[PDB]
Amino acid sequence: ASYHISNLLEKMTSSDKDFRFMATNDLMTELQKDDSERKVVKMILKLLEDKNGEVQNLAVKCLGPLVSKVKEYQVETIVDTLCTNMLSDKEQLRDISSIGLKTVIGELPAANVCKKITGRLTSAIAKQEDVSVQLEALDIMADMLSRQGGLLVNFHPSILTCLLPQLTSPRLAVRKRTIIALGHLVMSCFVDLIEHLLSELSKNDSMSTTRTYIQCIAAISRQAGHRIGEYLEKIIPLVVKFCNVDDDELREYCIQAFESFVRRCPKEVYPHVSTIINICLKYLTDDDMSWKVRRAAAKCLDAVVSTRHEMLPEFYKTVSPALISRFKEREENVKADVFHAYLSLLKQTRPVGETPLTMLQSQVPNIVKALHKQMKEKSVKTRQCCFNMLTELVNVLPGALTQHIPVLVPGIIFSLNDKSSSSNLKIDALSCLYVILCNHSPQVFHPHVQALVPPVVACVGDPFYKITSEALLVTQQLVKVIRPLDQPSSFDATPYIKDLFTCTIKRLKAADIDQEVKERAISCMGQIICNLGDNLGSDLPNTLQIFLERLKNEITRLTTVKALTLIAGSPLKIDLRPVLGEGVPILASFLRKNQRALKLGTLSALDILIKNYSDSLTAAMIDAVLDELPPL
Amino acid sequence: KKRFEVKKWNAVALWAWDIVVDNCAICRNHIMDLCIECQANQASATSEECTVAWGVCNHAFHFHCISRWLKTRQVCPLDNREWEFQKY
Amino acid sequence: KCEQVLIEKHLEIFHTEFQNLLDADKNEDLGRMYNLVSRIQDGLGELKKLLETHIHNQGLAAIEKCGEAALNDPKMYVQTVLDVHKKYNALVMSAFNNDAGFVAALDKACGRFINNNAVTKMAQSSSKSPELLARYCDSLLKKELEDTLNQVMVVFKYIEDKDVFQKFYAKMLAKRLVHQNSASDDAEASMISKLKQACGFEYTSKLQRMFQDIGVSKDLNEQFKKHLDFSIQVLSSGSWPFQQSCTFALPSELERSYQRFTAFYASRHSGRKLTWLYQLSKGELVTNCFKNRYTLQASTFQMAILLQYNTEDAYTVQQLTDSTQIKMDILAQVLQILLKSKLLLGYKNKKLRVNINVPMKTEQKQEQETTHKNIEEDRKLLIQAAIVRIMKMRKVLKHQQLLGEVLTQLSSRFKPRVPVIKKCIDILIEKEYLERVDGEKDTYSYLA
Ligand SMILES: [Zn+2]
Ligand SMILES: [Zn+2]
Ligand SMILES: [Zn+2]
C-alpha cells in the first residue's frame, strides 16, 4: 500500500540498524508474497555504501528478486552505477559490487543488461596494471558464458579478439581463468568462430610452445569435441613431434589423447597414437615425477578400451594385453589403474579368425601366475583388486581356472585368516570363493574341504552382518558341492557334520540378529537338512520347532517355506510326520493375505509335503486346506 | 657442553588498543573481570554466558554493557562510529 | 491402459526387480525400466520412496562397514563418500536424465544419511560431518584438484549445519596462514571465489579482513627490511580468533630482535600494546655438535625446552615447569611426543632434512569440544539477540508467531530447539527486558 510503503520508508530511514533489519525482512516478505520504485532504488543504492555487513547482506539479497517487479528503465542506470563502483579503491566495496552483480545475473532469466556488461568488460578485460581486476572480470565472464550464451549476434568476435592477448599472462591463475572462460564460451557456442580460434592456435603452435596452448586445446575439446574432425590430422603429428623432448612436458600431450577418443569415436588414426602411448608407458628413471607420468597413459588406455568395441582381435593379437599384464610391479596408483583397465576390458569381452576364447584361454595361465606373484603384498587395496580380478575372470566364462585351484587356495586362506583385513576385503574374498565353487565342478574341490571348512566356519560367526551373510552363502555352497546328488561321489564327510551343524544352529536363533543373516542361516539349514540330514538323527525331531515358530513371523516367512520345500523334495527320506500335524494348519492360516510369492511358496511346500509324506493325514488339516482354497 | 643456534623465528604479533585492554569505558572495571550487575544477581547461566564482544574497529566490550548502550545511541564510547558485531 | 495393466498387477515384481538391479551394478536396465514407467500419470511415489530408502540403506551400510577407523581417519571416509556421490550422480545422469523429483529425492537422501549415520550414532553428536569435511579440505590444501573441490562444494549444500563448516574453515585458514605451508594461490583464489558465490558475505568478510591484515603485515615487513634472519607476522585482535597464550620466558639469545621491533612500533604506532603469541612459530636449528649438520622444524615450545638443556649439568621437569609457566598436561604431552622420535647427541637419521612437526593427537579432541561448545553459546546468543531485537518494531505479538518468525529467519542457517528458545525467552524476561501482561496468556510487551 502507498501509506504502508511510506510508513516503512519513514521509519526505516532513521539511521538505525534493527529498524533497517526489520524493514528489509518486511519488504522481502512482501515481495515473496513510479516514484516508489525510484525511492527504493535510491535508498538501496545508498545502503550499498553502508559499512554495516548485515545491512549490506540484506540489501544485496533483496536486490535479487527485486528485478522481477522493478521497472525496466533504471536497470541500465543501476547496472552502470554498479560497474562504476566496481572500479573503486576499497576492496570491501569491490567484493560487494561483485556479489551484487553475481546475484542479479543469477536471478536474471530487460535484456540490455547483458549487452551493456559484455561491452564494458570487452574494454575492461584489456591489459591493466591491477591483476585483481582481471581475475574478477574473468570470473564474471565465466559466469556469463555458463548462464548466458544466447543470441550474441555481434559480440562474440569482440570478446574473442580482446581475450586473445590475455592468454599469455605470466600468472598461472589468470591463464587458468582465461582457459575456463574459453571453454565455457565454446560450450555455449558461431558458424566460423572456432575456425579462427583453431587457425590461431595452429599458427601459435609453430613457435616457442608452452603448456598454455595445449591446456587450452584440451579444455575447448573437452567442452566441445564434436566439431573438430578435419583439424586433427595436423594435431596428432604436432603432439608426436613434440613428445620427443627431454624436459617434462608430455603430461598435457597424453591427456589430449583420451579426451580425443572420448569425444570423437570414428577416426582411422588409432594405431599411431596407440603405439605412442605404448612406448610412453615405458618411462622409468616430490622431486621425482616419473611415478606420475604413466597416469595419463593409463587413462588413455582406459578410454581406448572403453570406446572401442568392434576391433577386439586387433587389441588381443598385439602385445597390448601382454604389456598390460607384465606392467604390474609399479606404484599403487599405476597398479590400481592397470587393474581397472583390465577389469574394464574383461567386462567388455562379453558379446554385445579365431574367437576370443582361444587367446583368453592361452593368456589365462599368464594372468594366473601374475596374480599369484601379486598376492605377496601386505596392502589391502592390492588384495581387493586381485579378488575382484579373480571374480571377473571366473564370472566371464564357466570352468575357466580349472587347473590352478591348488595354488590359488592358499592365497584365499591367508586373506581370510589374517588379522589385518578390512571388512570389504573379507566380503569380496568370500564372494569370490562362493562364485568359484558355484561355477567350477565339484570334482576340483574335494581335496580342499579340509582347508576350506575351518576358515569358513570361523568366519560364520562375526559381529558384522554382511560378512556373516556371505559366510553363510559360502557354507551353503560348500555343503551343496561336497555332496552332489546328481553324480555319485566317494568321500567321507562325517567329521564336518557337527562342525557345520554347530555354527548353523547357533546362527539360527534370534540373538537380536538382522533379518538378512537370519534368512541366510535358515537357507543354510534347509540345504543342509535336505542334502545331509540322515547323519543328524538326535537333533532332527527337536530342532524342527524353530521353523514352525518362525513361520508366524512375517520377517522370515518366505525363506523358511523355501527351506521346507527343499527339505521335503529330497531323494533321501526326512522324518517330518510329527511336525506335519502341527505344521499344516500354520501354513494354511497364511492363505488369507494378498502375497503372490508367499502363496506360491506355501502351496509348493504343502504340495511336496503331501506328495512325499502321506502315511498319516487327519481330517482337520484336509478340511482346513480345502476351506482355504476359495480365497486362493 | 651441547649448544646450537637458531636461524629464523617468524613470530606472530597481536596488537590491541591500550585503553581497551586497560578497562572498558561503559563500566569502570577491569575488562578481564566480569561486570558488576551480572554478579549482583546470580540465579542462572547468565554469570557464565557473559563474555566480551568484538567489532570491526577492534574494540572489546561486554555483551551486556553494549546491549544496554543500544537504543540510547548506536556508537561505541571511545571511537565515534556505528557499532558492528563480528565475533563473540 | 497398457501401462496400467502392465504395472497395476505387477507392482511387487517390478519393485523387487528395482531393488535387485539397484543392489547390483546394472544401470542400463535401471534406465530402461525408468523409461518404461515414466509414462505413468502420478504413480511414481512408491518408486521414489523405494529408491530413497535404498539410498539410506546403502549409506548406512557403507558408513558402518568401515567402523572404528573412519572416526580417526577422515581421509578414507571422505573418499568413500565422494566415490558414492559421484557414482549416484553418474547413475542419475545415465538413467534418470536429471529428473527434478528424482534429483530432489537423491538430495534429501544424502542429507539424511550425512546428518545421521552409524558413526554419528555412537558419538552422540550430529555435527561431525562438517568436521570431517573441513579436515579433508585442510589436509588436501596442506602441501588437478578443481573437480574434487567442486564436488565437495556441491555435496556440502546438503549439510544443514553450514555455520559449523564455515567456522571450522575460518579457524583452519587462520592457523594455516601463520606458517608458509599453503597450496598454490590459484587454488586458494578459486576456493575463495566458490565460497563467495555459494556462501554469503558474512563468512567471506573475515576472510577478506585476514587477507588485508596479512597484506599490510607483509608490506610493513618489506618496508622494515628496506630500511634495514628474522620475521614477524602482525595480526589484529578482532580478526584472528586465538586463545590468549600463557606466561612464557623470553630467550636471551634474541632479546634484541623483539626489543627493536617493540621500539619501532612504539615510535611509529604509539599507544598500542602488543601481545606476541609464542605458540605458532617454526624454524630450523643449525646443529654443529652432532656428527653431521641436521635441521629440525621446531615450534616455539619444544624449541625452548631444548634450549633449556644448553649449559646445565642437571635437568629436571619441575624447574622448567616453574620457569616456563606452562600447563603440566601440554608439557608432558610435548615431552612424550618429542621423546617418541628418539631425539632426547649421537643418533643419526636417514635424511639430512627431517620434519619433526607432527599432529598433536591429544589436544585435537579437547579443541574440537571447545569449538563445539563455543558454537553452542554463539547460537544461543544469536537467537537471544534476534528475539530481543525483533520486538523493537513489533509491539505485541503471540508466542507462536514469534517462534515461527525466529525459525524462518534462521532456517537456512540452523534449526534451534524449542526448549532452548523457551529458556532464552524466560531468562530475557528475568533480566528485566520484558513484562508479563496479565490481560492475555503467553503474551509479552516490549520494555526498555
Ligand atoms: Zn554481564
Ligand atoms: Zn562492562
Ligand atoms: Zn570502537
Side-chain angles (χ1 to χ4, degrees), chain A residues 360-369 372 390 393-394 397-410 436 439-441 443-445 448:
Chain A
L360 191 43
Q361 189 67 263
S362 36
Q363 300 262 31
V364 153
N366 295 347
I367 301 151
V368 165
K369 31 175 168 31
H372 172 45
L390 272 163
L393 195 62
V394 169
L397 81 158
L401 306 70
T402 192
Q403 284 145 250
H404 304 273
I405 285 151
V407 296
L408 287 159
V409 158
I436 283 159
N439 288 106
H440 295 158
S441 293
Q443 309 304 328
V444 287
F445 296 118
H448 312 282

Short mmCIF file of all heavy atoms in Angstrom, two decimals, chain A residues 360-369 372 390 393-394 397-410 436 439-441 443-445 448:
data_model
loop_
_atom_site.label_atom_id
_atom_site.label_comp_id
_atom_site.label_asym_id
_atom_site.label_seq_id
_atom_site.Cartn_x
_atom_site.Cartn_y
_atom_site.Cartn_z
N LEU A 360 41.99 -65.91 -24.90
CA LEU A 360 41.70 -65.80 -23.47
C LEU A 360 42.21 -67.02 -22.71
O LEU A 360 42.84 -66.89 -21.65
CB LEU A 360 40.20 -65.62 -23.25
CG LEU A 360 39.77 -65.23 -21.83
CD1 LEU A 360 40.68 -64.16 -21.25
CD2 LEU A 360 38.32 -64.78 -21.81
N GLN A 361 41.95 -68.22 -23.24
CA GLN A 361 42.41 -69.44 -22.59
C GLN A 361 43.93 -69.51 -22.54
O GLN A 361 44.51 -69.93 -21.53
CB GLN A 361 41.84 -70.66 -23.31
CG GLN A 361 42.08 -71.98 -22.58
CD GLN A 361 41.33 -72.07 -21.27
OE1 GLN A 361 41.88 -71.80 -20.20
NE2 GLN A 361 40.06 -72.45 -21.34
N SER A 362 44.60 -69.10 -23.63
CA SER A 362 46.06 -69.15 -23.64
C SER A 362 46.66 -68.14 -22.68
O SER A 362 47.72 -68.40 -22.09
CB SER A 362 46.60 -68.93 -25.05
OG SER A 362 45.82 -67.99 -25.76
N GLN A 363 46.03 -66.98 -22.50
CA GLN A 363 46.52 -65.98 -21.56
C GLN A 363 46.11 -66.25 -20.12
O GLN A 363 46.65 -65.61 -19.21
CB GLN A 363 46.05 -64.58 -21.97
CG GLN A 363 46.52 -64.14 -23.34
CD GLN A 363 47.75 -63.26 -23.28
OE1 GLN A 363 48.58 -63.39 -22.38
NE2 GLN A 363 47.88 -62.35 -24.24
N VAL A 364 45.15 -67.15 -19.89
CA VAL A 364 44.73 -67.46 -18.52
C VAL A 364 45.90 -67.88 -17.63
O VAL A 364 46.02 -67.34 -16.52
CB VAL A 364 43.59 -68.50 -18.53
CG1 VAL A 364 43.59 -69.31 -17.24
CG2 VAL A 364 42.25 -67.81 -18.70
N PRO A 365 46.78 -68.81 -18.04
CA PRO A 365 47.92 -69.13 -17.16
C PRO A 365 48.80 -67.93 -16.84
O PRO A 365 49.29 -67.81 -15.71
CB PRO A 365 48.68 -70.20 -17.95
CG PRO A 365 47.68 -70.81 -18.85
CD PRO A 365 46.74 -69.70 -19.21
N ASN A 366 49.01 -67.04 -17.81
CA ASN A 366 49.83 -65.86 -17.56
C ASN A 366 49.19 -64.96 -16.51
O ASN A 366 49.86 -64.49 -15.58
CB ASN A 366 50.07 -65.09 -18.85
CG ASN A 366 50.89 -65.88 -19.86
OD1 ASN A 366 51.48 -66.90 -19.52
ND2 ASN A 366 50.93 -65.40 -21.09
N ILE A 367 47.88 -64.72 -16.64
CA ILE A 367 47.15 -63.94 -15.65
C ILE A 367 47.23 -64.61 -14.29
O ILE A 367 47.36 -63.94 -13.26
CB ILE A 367 45.69 -63.76 -16.11
CG1 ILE A 367 45.62 -63.04 -17.45
CG2 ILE A 367 44.90 -62.99 -15.06
CD1 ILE A 367 44.41 -63.41 -18.29
N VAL A 368 47.17 -65.95 -14.27
CA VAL A 368 47.18 -66.68 -13.00
C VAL A 368 48.51 -66.50 -12.28
O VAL A 368 48.54 -66.19 -11.09
CB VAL A 368 46.87 -68.17 -13.25
CG1 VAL A 368 47.24 -69.00 -12.03
CG2 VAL A 368 45.40 -68.36 -13.57
N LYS A 369 49.63 -66.66 -12.99
CA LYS A 369 50.91 -66.52 -12.29
C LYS A 369 51.18 -65.06 -11.94
O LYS A 369 51.80 -64.76 -10.91
CB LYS A 369 52.10 -67.10 -13.07
CG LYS A 369 52.09 -67.10 -14.58
CD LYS A 369 53.47 -67.62 -15.04
CE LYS A 369 53.56 -67.96 -16.51
NZ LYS A 369 52.68 -67.11 -17.35
N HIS A 372 49.20 -64.52 -8.80
CA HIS A 372 49.83 -65.22 -7.69
C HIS A 372 51.07 -64.47 -7.20
O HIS A 372 51.31 -64.37 -5.99
CB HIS A 372 50.20 -66.65 -8.09
CG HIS A 372 51.03 -67.37 -7.08
ND1 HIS A 372 50.75 -67.34 -5.73
CD2 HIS A 372 52.14 -68.13 -7.21
CE1 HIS A 372 51.64 -68.05 -5.07
NE2 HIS A 372 52.50 -68.54 -5.95
N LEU A 390 39.94 -61.92 -9.88
CA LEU A 390 39.58 -63.34 -9.89
C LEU A 390 38.09 -63.53 -10.09
O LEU A 390 37.66 -64.41 -10.86
CB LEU A 390 40.04 -64.00 -8.59
CG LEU A 390 41.46 -64.54 -8.54
CD1 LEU A 390 41.90 -64.79 -7.11
CD2 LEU A 390 41.58 -65.82 -9.36
N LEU A 393 37.31 -62.85 -13.73
CA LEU A 393 37.83 -63.91 -14.60
C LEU A 393 37.02 -65.19 -14.47
O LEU A 393 36.94 -65.98 -15.42
CB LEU A 393 39.30 -64.18 -14.29
CG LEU A 393 40.08 -64.98 -15.33
CD1 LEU A 393 40.13 -64.25 -16.66
CD2 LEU A 393 41.48 -65.28 -14.83
N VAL A 394 36.41 -65.43 -13.30
CA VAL A 394 35.58 -66.61 -13.14
C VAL A 394 34.18 -66.37 -13.70
O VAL A 394 33.57 -67.28 -14.28
CB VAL A 394 35.54 -67.03 -11.66
CG1 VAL A 394 34.48 -68.09 -11.41
CG2 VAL A 394 36.91 -67.54 -11.22
N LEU A 397 33.37 -66.55 -18.00
CA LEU A 397 33.04 -67.85 -18.57
C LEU A 397 33.17 -68.92 -17.51
O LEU A 397 34.00 -68.81 -16.60
CB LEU A 397 33.93 -68.19 -19.78
CG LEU A 397 35.33 -68.76 -19.52
CD1 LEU A 397 35.82 -69.53 -20.73
CD2 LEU A 397 36.31 -67.65 -19.17
N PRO A 398 32.35 -69.97 -17.59
CA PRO A 398 32.44 -71.05 -16.59
C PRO A 398 33.57 -72.02 -16.89
O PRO A 398 33.96 -72.22 -18.05
CB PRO A 398 31.08 -71.74 -16.70
CG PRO A 398 30.65 -71.50 -18.11
CD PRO A 398 31.27 -70.20 -18.56
N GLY A 399 34.09 -72.62 -15.83
CA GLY A 399 35.18 -73.57 -15.97
C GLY A 399 36.45 -72.98 -16.53
O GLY A 399 37.12 -73.61 -17.36
N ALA A 400 36.80 -71.77 -16.10
CA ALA A 400 37.99 -71.10 -16.63
C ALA A 400 39.25 -71.57 -15.92
O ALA A 400 40.16 -72.13 -16.54
CB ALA A 400 37.84 -69.58 -16.51
N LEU A 401 39.33 -71.35 -14.60
CA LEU A 401 40.50 -71.71 -13.81
C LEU A 401 40.26 -73.09 -13.19
O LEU A 401 40.01 -73.23 -11.99
CB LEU A 401 40.80 -70.65 -12.75
CG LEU A 401 40.98 -69.17 -13.10
CD1 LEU A 401 39.69 -68.48 -13.53
CD2 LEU A 401 41.62 -68.42 -11.94
N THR A 402 40.36 -74.11 -14.03
CA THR A 402 40.18 -75.49 -13.60
C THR A 402 41.50 -76.21 -13.36
O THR A 402 41.51 -77.41 -13.09
CB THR A 402 39.35 -76.27 -14.64
OG1 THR A 402 38.95 -77.53 -14.09
CG2 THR A 402 40.16 -76.50 -15.91
N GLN A 403 42.63 -75.49 -13.45
CA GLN A 403 43.95 -76.09 -13.27
C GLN A 403 44.83 -75.28 -12.33
O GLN A 403 46.05 -75.49 -12.29
CB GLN A 403 44.64 -76.27 -14.62
CG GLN A 403 44.13 -77.44 -15.44
CD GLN A 403 44.13 -77.15 -16.93
OE1 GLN A 403 43.07 -77.00 -17.55
NE2 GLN A 403 45.31 -77.06 -17.52
N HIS A 404 44.25 -74.35 -11.56
CA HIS A 404 45.03 -73.53 -10.65
C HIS A 404 44.39 -73.38 -9.28
O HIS A 404 44.81 -72.51 -8.50
CB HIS A 404 45.28 -72.15 -11.26
CG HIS A 404 45.95 -72.19 -12.60
ND1 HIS A 404 47.32 -72.23 -12.75
CD2 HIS A 404 45.44 -72.19 -13.85
CE1 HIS A 404 47.62 -72.26 -14.03
NE2 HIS A 404 46.49 -72.23 -14.72
N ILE A 405 43.37 -74.18 -8.96
CA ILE A 405 42.78 -74.13 -7.62
C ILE A 405 43.78 -74.49 -6.53
O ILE A 405 43.82 -73.78 -5.51
CB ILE A 405 41.50 -74.98 -7.57
CG1 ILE A 405 40.36 -74.25 -8.29
CG2 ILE A 405 41.11 -75.29 -6.13
CD1 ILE A 405 39.34 -75.18 -8.90
N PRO A 406 44.59 -75.55 -6.65
CA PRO A 406 45.54 -75.85 -5.56
C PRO A 406 46.51 -74.73 -5.25
O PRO A 406 46.92 -74.57 -4.09
CB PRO A 406 46.27 -77.10 -6.06
CG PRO A 406 45.32 -77.73 -7.01
CD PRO A 406 44.60 -76.61 -7.67
N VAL A 407 46.91 -73.93 -6.25
CA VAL A 407 47.86 -72.85 -5.99
C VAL A 407 47.16 -71.55 -5.60
O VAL A 407 47.81 -70.66 -5.04
CB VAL A 407 48.78 -72.62 -7.20
CG1 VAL A 407 49.65 -73.84 -7.45
CG2 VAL A 407 47.96 -72.27 -8.43
N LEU A 408 45.87 -71.41 -5.89
CA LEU A 408 45.13 -70.21 -5.52
C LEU A 408 44.43 -70.33 -4.17
O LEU A 408 44.09 -69.30 -3.58
CB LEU A 408 44.10 -69.87 -6.60
CG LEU A 408 44.64 -69.29 -7.90
CD1 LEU A 408 43.64 -69.49 -9.03
CD2 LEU A 408 44.99 -67.82 -7.74
N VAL A 409 44.20 -71.55 -3.69
CA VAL A 409 43.55 -71.72 -2.38
C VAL A 409 44.37 -71.11 -1.25
O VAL A 409 43.78 -70.40 -0.41
CB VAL A 409 43.21 -73.20 -2.14
CG1 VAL A 409 43.06 -73.49 -0.66
CG2 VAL A 409 41.94 -73.57 -2.89
N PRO A 410 45.69 -71.32 -1.14
CA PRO A 410 46.43 -70.73 -0.01
C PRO A 410 46.32 -69.22 0.07
O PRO A 410 46.30 -68.67 1.18
CB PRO A 410 47.87 -71.19 -0.25
CG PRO A 410 47.75 -72.42 -1.05
CD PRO A 410 46.56 -72.22 -1.93
N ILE A 436 33.50 -69.13 -7.31
CA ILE A 436 34.39 -70.17 -7.82
C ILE A 436 33.80 -71.55 -7.54
O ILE A 436 33.80 -72.42 -8.42
CB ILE A 436 35.79 -70.02 -7.21
CG1 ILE A 436 36.55 -68.87 -7.88
CG2 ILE A 436 36.58 -71.31 -7.34
CD1 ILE A 436 37.70 -68.33 -7.06
N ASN A 439 30.62 -71.98 -10.01
CA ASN A 439 30.87 -72.18 -11.44
C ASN A 439 31.64 -73.47 -11.70
O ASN A 439 31.26 -74.26 -12.57
CB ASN A 439 31.63 -70.98 -12.02
CG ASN A 439 30.76 -69.74 -12.13
OD1 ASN A 439 30.88 -68.80 -11.35
ND2 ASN A 439 29.86 -69.74 -13.11
N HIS A 440 32.72 -73.70 -10.96
CA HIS A 440 33.55 -74.86 -11.21
C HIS A 440 32.87 -76.14 -10.73
O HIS A 440 32.01 -76.12 -9.85
CB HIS A 440 34.91 -74.70 -10.53
CG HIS A 440 35.73 -73.57 -11.08
ND1 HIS A 440 36.74 -72.97 -10.37
CD2 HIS A 440 35.69 -72.94 -12.28
CE1 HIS A 440 37.29 -72.01 -11.11
NE2 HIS A 440 36.67 -71.98 -12.27
N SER A 441 33.27 -77.26 -11.33
CA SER A 441 32.69 -78.55 -10.99
C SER A 441 33.10 -78.96 -9.58
O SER A 441 34.14 -78.53 -9.07
CB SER A 441 33.13 -79.60 -12.00
OG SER A 441 32.57 -79.35 -13.28
N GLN A 443 34.32 -81.68 -8.68
CA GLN A 443 35.47 -82.58 -8.72
C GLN A 443 36.79 -81.90 -8.40
O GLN A 443 37.77 -82.59 -8.10
CB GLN A 443 35.56 -83.26 -10.09
CG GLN A 443 34.27 -83.90 -10.57
CD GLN A 443 33.72 -84.93 -9.59
OE1 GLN A 443 34.47 -85.60 -8.88
NE2 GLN A 443 32.40 -85.06 -9.55
N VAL A 444 36.85 -80.57 -8.45
CA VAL A 444 38.09 -79.85 -8.18
C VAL A 444 38.00 -79.14 -6.84
O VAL A 444 38.68 -78.14 -6.61
CB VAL A 444 38.42 -78.86 -9.31
CG1 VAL A 444 38.88 -79.61 -10.55
CG2 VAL A 444 37.21 -78.00 -9.63
N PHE A 445 37.15 -79.65 -5.94
CA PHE A 445 37.03 -79.10 -4.61
C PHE A 445 37.01 -80.15 -3.51
O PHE A 445 36.87 -79.79 -2.34
CB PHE A 445 35.76 -78.23 -4.50
CG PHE A 445 35.78 -77.02 -5.38
CD1 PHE A 445 34.84 -76.86 -6.38
CD2 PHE A 445 36.74 -76.03 -5.19
CE1 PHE A 445 34.86 -75.74 -7.19
CE2 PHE A 445 36.76 -74.91 -6.00
CZ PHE A 445 35.81 -74.76 -7.00
N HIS A 448 40.17 -80.08 -1.03
CA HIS A 448 40.35 -78.81 -0.35
C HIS A 448 39.34 -78.55 0.75
O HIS A 448 39.33 -77.46 1.32
CB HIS A 448 40.29 -77.66 -1.37
CG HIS A 448 41.15 -77.88 -2.58
ND1 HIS A 448 42.51 -77.71 -2.57
CD2 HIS A 448 40.83 -78.26 -3.84
CE1 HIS A 448 43.00 -77.97 -3.77
NE2 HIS A 448 41.99 -78.31 -4.56
#
